């Protein structure tokens, strides 16, 4: 996966992020709180919104299709997601990814890029 500068983590320290994660997980327990950010140097559209609350049983594949619409991509342009710095399987649910890969602040972080392989 790409080496990420997470703007959410640059702006907000762990204590602040954990408080927000705590709150949102109690308010919306069946939704996964996800922070989505673009890989540095990718020339894809930057998402206008980075914070999403996603149904737990939505698949990665279905999430690809929703994000694709929001970043104005064609069928010709490539889009790849990275969770825990690896590409998730398309049938995996957002709930399963959260269970396995949420950070200590209680968010799931997902990076996107037009490239699939990074040094």
């Amino acid at each position: 996966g790409p080496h990420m500068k997470w703007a959410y983590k640059e702006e907000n320290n762990f204590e602040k992020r954990r408080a927000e994660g705590d709150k949102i997980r109690r308010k919306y327990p069946d939704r996964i709180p996800v922070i989505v950010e673009k890989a540095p140097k990718s020339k894809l559209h930057d998402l206008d919104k980075k914070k999403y609350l996603v149904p737990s049983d939505l698949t990665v594949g279905q999430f690809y299709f929703l994000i694709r619409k929001r970043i104005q991509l064609r069928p010709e342009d490539a889009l790849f997601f990275f969770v825990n710095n690896v590409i998730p399987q398309t049938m995996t649910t957002m709930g399963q990814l959260y269970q396995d890969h949420h950070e200590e602040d209680l968010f799931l972080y997902i990076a996107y890029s037009d490239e699939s392989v990074y040094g």
């Binding site: 949102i24 919306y28 939704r31 709180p33 919104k49 914070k51 999403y52 609350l53 996603v54 149904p55 939505l58 999430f63 929703l66």
Partner: peptide, 5 residues
């Protein structure tokens, strides 16, 4: 604020 999908 969070966006609901």
């Amino acid at each position: 604020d969070f966006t609901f999908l």
